[PDB]
Amino acid sequence: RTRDFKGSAIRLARRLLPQRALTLAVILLGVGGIAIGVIGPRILGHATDLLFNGVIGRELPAGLTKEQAVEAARARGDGTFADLLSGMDIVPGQGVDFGAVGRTLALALGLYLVAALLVWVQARLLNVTVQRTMVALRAEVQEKIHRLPLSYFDSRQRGEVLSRVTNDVDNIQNSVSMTISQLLTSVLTVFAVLVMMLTISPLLTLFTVVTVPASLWVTRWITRRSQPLFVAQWRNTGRLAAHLEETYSGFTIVKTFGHREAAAGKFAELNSETQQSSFGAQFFSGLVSPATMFIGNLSYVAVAVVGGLQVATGQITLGSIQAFIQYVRQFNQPLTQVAGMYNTLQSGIASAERVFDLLDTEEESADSPRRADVRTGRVEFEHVSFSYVPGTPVIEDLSLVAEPGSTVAIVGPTGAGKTTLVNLLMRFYDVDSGRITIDGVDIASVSRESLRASIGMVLQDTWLFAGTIYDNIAYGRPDADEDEVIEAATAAYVDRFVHTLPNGYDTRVDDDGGAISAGEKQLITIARAVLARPKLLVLDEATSSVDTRTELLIAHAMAELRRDRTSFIIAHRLSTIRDADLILVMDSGRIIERGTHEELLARHGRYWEMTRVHLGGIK
Amino acid sequence: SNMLWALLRQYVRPYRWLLAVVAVLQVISNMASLYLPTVNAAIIDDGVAKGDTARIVELGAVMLGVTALQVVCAVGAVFFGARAATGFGHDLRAAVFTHVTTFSAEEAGRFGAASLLTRTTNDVGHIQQLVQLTVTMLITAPIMSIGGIFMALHQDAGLSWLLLVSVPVLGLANYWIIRHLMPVFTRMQSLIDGINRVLRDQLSGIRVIRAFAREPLERVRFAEANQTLSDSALEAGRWQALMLPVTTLVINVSSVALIWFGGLRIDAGQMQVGSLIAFLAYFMQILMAVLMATFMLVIFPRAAVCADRIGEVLSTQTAITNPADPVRPAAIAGDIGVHDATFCYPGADRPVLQDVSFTVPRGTTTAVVGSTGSGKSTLISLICRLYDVTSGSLRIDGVDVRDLDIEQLWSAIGLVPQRGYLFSGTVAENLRYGRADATDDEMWEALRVAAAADFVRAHPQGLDMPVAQGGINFSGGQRQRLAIARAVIRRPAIYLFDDAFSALDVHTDARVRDALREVAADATVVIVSQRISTVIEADQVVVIDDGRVVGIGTHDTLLADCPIYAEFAESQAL
Ligand SMILES: Nc1ncnc2c1ncn2[C@@H]1O[C@H](COP(=O)(O)OP(=O)(O)O)[C@@H](O)[C@H]1O
């Protein structure tokens, strides 16, 4: 599907026009090469005409007038032959002058050589300019990805933007790099050949160009015929992919219970069905070229027969007919895959307009380089009422206070708005009718990058990028050393299992080792956070997939022991955060109560409810 | 490399019944396409020279007959080639799936689910795409050259030598270009995959990337990746720009030398004028076909890398199999005779599991607890023979598990994995996997046992309610409850629980354990968990750390026997 052809096309062009002189020079070289390549057959036909003249002028008696020879031939009969002689230019009795033939063929070969050289240099220049502009466009895409706010990514499908920035750029490449050369040469060739063949003979031009409406009609009809089968093939391949999904993802559950045979039978049935569907659809799609080839060849037959008839009449020369027989073939050449270029160009148009809409969105609000840093680690919140969309006050009138060096923790039900709070601390989303301060200064007056370089943050889920475990750990501070890396590793207890992996600190994390489960991925992530030596650590469910004992040891190691920094701890298990310098109880925003372990349990709050109810098994 | 050709010559072998017909039809189509300008030229040679417009009109009738034969045989060739390519794709998909089903969990983790699926659904598609293109579009150029030389020989024994010497230099130039260009294309694909991986990793992070403020590093990494891709792009573009001009120049110089040599022989009377028209048409057909095929040829590196991946899948044979005559007790019960069990991946320093040993009587319930990374996760798979031990031995009913019938064992083992997964469909179908022929009341009783009858009854349409892939439509531990019901309908002699109870609350876990004791008292139960409350009531408990046992006994004895479990006790106490 497409929604803007002209606008996206002109934007794609204006992505290339900045070359200006280079672009116009490339266009000039291309058009000159096409024109001279069209001209070449004309001089070849002229040379063939000279040869044919010198051949059939031998049998006539020498010294006669051309009109006299025509009359002598016509008197004995040979009416068509007499017409041929009348319409053709021979002095009777004279042979071929090889000097003129040599001159003409030398001119032809020279112009062909310069045509090839110009075509090559034009191709090299177009490749250089398209690759340069393409690198610039991809760099702009990357820069925008660096500048975009988080709400843009969070408000769409997970694979949507990924396909828009990865696959659509490749489509842009495989579309424009092809078209701007081949389609441009095709259109220049068709214009040049049509004007030359119009200067040759008009009836021949009609007998040729009748194929264009026929070609477009037949390709449109074949496309409309194949579209239902193409959609069916798409649907059936989607069904096959989905079935492969649930038989591969739950492969252990398939090997257990012994259901390999049933899954194999279902797969075989749907695979055969998709085989038939793909067979039909692909046959109907691939039969486009033979049909237009036959239409062009029927046009060629008409050209040949009418050219023979007209040569017998004498209205035209043989060499012009030879040039025309060449020209009809070079005219047929583009139409064989003009539909292919059209569909590829339309796909590139759609991808280009999508990419441009991505590149024209709002960016971050030009963070002022205030460059504020923390000294003690005091935090403060003032009546923030943030919402993803107006009408859903997920955060509402919180006034939490934490002294520097405190390990204040928060408890609440899943989905109540914890991650929203930690994002607001990160300036991932702006504040709404609230004030937040670090060490007594508002963050909104502080540059975002300087803040984020000093916080230290881990999410509910882990993130890992292609590379070794050592690379993932060192991502926290690249200019550190392996001694520091292993020190942080021992601090985060990843060492207890990293040696169990095939090669410690060297396993490709994108290549799952099987033994690398979610909890130890969380350990890797928290180790990465540790290496950066943060002063405002926040633990947002970073220990969900790990045992409680490991959580208590690591917490006592790097938060309770590290009295020099304050910390936020978020966990769904109360015993994991018991005795952690006052605890907050938040229930879908609307922070309820605050206090230390004993004081908060003694006041019979919701914290007391959850501690009493869950441990006692009461429901 | 040559992996693509090996896979082809192995798997398209049953389709020589069809590809030969495709080739024959392509040959006859191109021979007709070259017979077309031959009689076109004959029109000038005879009809024009004699002036007989009749000869022209019947030669036009023959013209139409030839082109009709060409189109019908060409469309037949395309039809049969499409059939052959689709059959090849179907056979490749079936073979890949059948071979990969023999894998264990080890190989599945080695390859990865998403990578495996994309390999088996898109790489095979690319391979069949290339097969159809080469059997319907690419082979035109070689057949075109062969037909051109053959028809030049047919026309005369003279001027044909110039065509016979002009075509091979074209072919050599094409081969020279492609030999250099192909490695550039494979490096192109490698860099494209790398940059796509970089983009995917960056977008997946975003939050963490902005948090650590590693913008300076990410920017330069993307810049260097794109610059390397640009260098490869320029390298490929050089040869691509060389491609068309050399072919065009070769055809043009062949044509000019053609006219130059033909004129001399025609002057002597050895050659006729129409042969020039025929030869020019032959060379232009050659140019069109060669350009078209070489332009389509850019698909080759895609098929090369796809074949490399498919060979990666197919070459790795499974290391787990029945030993061609295992024992069939058919009445196995709970023994689990772990004895000095050891397990370790190759190249690792510390083993996954080592020198552990424990046994359970026929109907007792045991559990294992410990810190994450201790290797307890793989112990369940070792019991169920998803992984084979390195040097240890664990026996069921006195005979080591590797000597058992693995199908019978899986029949007698009820397992809930740590990755609670459900197949797309309905509960009344996913739950069938425990028995495949269960009854509705049995399913409802299982939901009662799994402490899950409440919400499944709450659904308006009944227990036969739809589920998405992986149970993602559910809230969480509901999936674990469904897995428990699936396991319990089977009535297995041995129960395997792998941290499934962690996703549940204390009271629901207690109810589930009480139901299991009520129903499966005769059978044995093995539980993996990180929660003490789920393990307290077990008959015996074993605690493992760093892949070895650190404590065995009961909860009452172990709470004071070893400080290692006292760590868990203090961590869970309030
Ligand atoms: N991208 C988003 N767009 C709209 N609403 C969202 C988005 N992300 C989260 N929410 C809503 O905001 C709430 C956030 O809760 P969350 O911070 O995840 O709590 P917790 O961290 O305890 O799980 C959720 O209930 C969800 O419905």
Whether A240 sits inside 8 A of B121 (CB atoms) is yes
Query: Beta partners for A539?
Result: A458, A569
For residues B66 and B48, what is the distance between their CA atoms, to the nearest angstrom? 21
Q: Which two tokens stand for residue A559?
A: 């938060």
Q: What residue ranges do the domains of chain B occupy?
A: 3-315, 337-572
Whether A116 sits inside 8 A of B245 (CB atoms) is yes
The distance between the two most distant Cα atoms of chain B, rounded to a whole number of Å, is 119
Q: Which helix (H) or strand (E) holds B540?
A: strand B540-545
Breakpoints of chain B, after residues (C–N > 2.5 Å): none
**Residue A594: strand, helix, or coil:** strand
Contact indicator for A383, A398 with CB cutoff of 8 Å: yes
Q: Which helix (H) or strand (E) holds B550?
A: strand B548-553
Per 3-state DSSP, chain A is made up of helix, strand and coil in percentages (nearest 5) of 65, 5, 30
Q: Which two tokens stand for residue A611?
A: 């501690």
Report the number of secondary-structure helices (H) and strands (E) in chain A: 25, 10
A391 to chain B nearest CA, in Å? Answer: 25
User: Given in angstroms, what resolution was this structure solved at?
Assistant: 4.0
Range A243-248, long-range pairs (CB < 8 A, 24+ positions)? A243/A267, A243/A270, A244/B97, A244/B117, A244/B120, A244/B121, A245/B117, A245/B424, A245/B469, A246/B423, A246/B424, A246/B469, A246/B470, A247/B423, A248/B108, A248/B113, A248/B116, A248/B117
**Residue A299: strand, helix, or coil:** helix
**A419 CA → ligand 1 middle, Å:** 7
A330: chain B residues, CB-CB within 8 Å? 284
B226: chain A residues, CB-CB within 8 Å? 135, 138-139, 142
A536: chain B residues, CB-CB within 8 Å? none
Whether B78 sits inside 8 A of A283 (CB atoms) is yes
B113: chain A residues, CB-CB within 8 Å? 248-249, 251
B299: chain A residues, CB-CB within 8 Å? none
Pocket probe mutation, ligand 1, options A152, A154, A384, A388, max atoms within 8 Å of Cβ: A388
CA A607 to chain centre: 50
Whether B79 sits inside 8 A of A287 (CB atoms) is yes
Q: Which two tokens stand for residue B66?
A: 């030839």
For residues A282 and B420, what is the distance between their CA atoms, to the nearest angstrom? 39
Residue A316 is given by DSSP the state S
Closest CA to A36 of B249, B290, B242, B247: B249
**Residue B545: strand, helix, or coil:** strand
Whether B234 sits inside 8 A of A305 (CB atoms) is no
For residues A297 and A289, what is the distance between their CA atoms, to the nearest angstrom? 12
Q: Which segments within A153-247 are labelled E, that is strand?
A: none
For residues B186 and B305, what is the distance between their CA atoms, to the nearest angstrom? 8
Pocket probe mutation, ligand 1, options A420, A539, A540, max atoms within 8 Å of Cβ: A420
B490: chain A residues, CB-CB within 8 Å? 257
Positive or negative: CA dihedral B469, B474, B477, B481 = negative
**A586 CA → ligand 1 middle, Å:** 14
Q: Locate tokens 């219970």: which residue? A: A257
Strand pairing class (B365-369; B540-545): parallel
B423 to chain A nearest CA, in Å? Answer: 5
Q: Which two tokens stand for residue B484?
A: 């428990």
Q: Which two tokens stand for residue B52?
A: 């007989």
Closest residue on chain A to B195 (Cα): A166
CA A43 to chain centre: 47
Question: Structure solved using which method?
Answer: cryo-EM
Closest CA to B158 of B38, B264, B253: B264
Pocket probe mutation, ligand 1, options A156, A394, A418, A569, max atoms within 8 Å of Cβ: A394
Q: Which segments within A435-565 are labelled E, that is strand?
A: 435-438, 441-442, 457-458, 536-540
Residue nearest to atom 1 of ligand 1 (CA): A154
Pocket of ligand 1 (CB under 6 A): A 154-155, 388, 394, 412, 414-420
**A162 CA → ligand 1 middle, Å:** 22
Residue A61 is given by DSSP the state P
Query: Beta partners for B528?
Result: B368, B498
**Cβ of B17: how many Cβ atoms within 10 Å?**
10
Nearest beta carbon to residue B259 from set A44, A138, A262 = A44
Terminal-to-terminal C-alpha distance of chain A: 54
Whether B78 sits inside 8 A of A142 (CB atoms) is no
Helices B300-315 and B53-101, packing angle to 10 deg: 30
Strand pairing class (A409-411; A583-585): parallel
Contact indicator for A583, A415 with CB cutoff of 8 Å: no
Q: Which helix (H) or strand (E) holds A409?
A: strand A409-411
CA-only gyration radius of chain A, Å: 39
A492 to chain B nearest CA, in Å? Answer: 12
A150 to chain B nearest CA, in Å? Answer: 8
**Residue A396: strand, helix, or coil:** coil
Closest residue on chain A to B59 (Cα): A305
Dihedral (Cα; A505, A511, A516, A522), 10-degree rounding: 80
For residues B258 and B165, what is the distance between their CA atoms, to the nearest angstrom? 11
The CATH architecture annotation of domain B337-572 reads 3-Layer(aba) Sandwich (3.40)
For residues B38 and B494, what is the distance between their CA atoms, to the nearest angstrom? 82
Atom of ligand 1 nearest to the CA of A151: 1
The distance between the two most distant Cα atoms of chain A, rounded to a whole number of Å, is 133
**A420 CA → ligand 1 middle, Å:** 6
Nearest beta carbon to residue A301 from set B60, B262, B264 = B60
The CATH architecture annotation of domain B3-315 reads Up-down Bundle (1.20)
**A385 CA → ligand 1 middle, Å:** 14
Residue to mutate among B29, B104, B185, B256, with most A CBs inside 10 A, is B256
**Cβ of A84: how many Cβ atoms within 10 Å?**
21
Whether A95 sits inside 8 A of B213 (CB atoms) is no
Q: Which two tokens stand for residue B375?
A: 């290797």
| The length of chain B, given as a count of residues | 574
Helix residue ranges per DSSP H, A57-166:
66-75, 79-87, 98-147, 150-154, 158-165
**Cβ of B545: how many Cβ atoms within 10 Å?**
19
For residues A506 and A469, what is the distance between their CA atoms, to the nearest angstrom? 6
**Residue A185: strand, helix, or coil:** helix
Task: Establish, for the pair of chains A and B, how many residue pairs have beta carbons separated by less than 8 Å.
Answer: 442
Strand pairing class (A457-458; A379-382): unpaired
Nearest beta carbon to residue B288 from set A51, A291, A333 = A333
Whether B238 sits inside 8 A of A115 (CB atoms) is no
For residues A381 and B152, what is the distance between their CA atoms, to the nearest angstrom? 90
Residue to mutate among A256, A541, A556, with most B CBs inside 10 A, is A256
For residues B191 and A410, what is the distance between their CA atoms, to the nearest angstrom? 46
Residue nearest to atom 19 of ligand 1 (CA): A415
Nearest beta carbon to residue B56 from set A98, A105, A308 = A308
Closest residue on chain A to B117 (Cα): A244
Terminal-to-terminal C-alpha distance of chain B: 64
CA A274 to chain centre: 27
Strand pairing class (B494-498; A536-540): unpaired
Pocket probe mutation, ligand 1, options A419, A460, A569, max atoms within 8 Å of Cβ: A419
**A569 CA → ligand 1 middle, Å:** 18
A576: chain B residues, CB-CB within 8 Å? 571
Atom of ligand 1 nearest to the CA of A155: 1
A255: chain B residues, CB-CB within 8 Å? 104-105, 386, 410
Residue to mutate among A193, A305, A573, with most B CBs inside 10 A, is A305
Contact indicator for A135, B230 with CB cutoff of 8 Å: yes
Report the number of secondary-structure helices (H) and strands (E) in chain B: 22, 12
**A388 CA → ligand 1 middle, Å:** 8
Output phi, psi for B356, to 5 deg.
-110, 150
Q: Residue A311: which residues within 8 A CB-CB, separation 6 or more?
A: A84, A87, A317, A318, A321, B44, B48
**Residue B341: strand, helix, or coil:** strand
**Residue A4: strand, helix, or coil:** coil
Whether A309 sits inside 8 A of B53 (CB atoms) is yes
Contact indicator for A504, A471 with CB cutoff of 8 Å: no
Give Cα separations from A611 to A235, A309, A410, A454, B356 (angstroms).
51, 103, 14, 34, 37
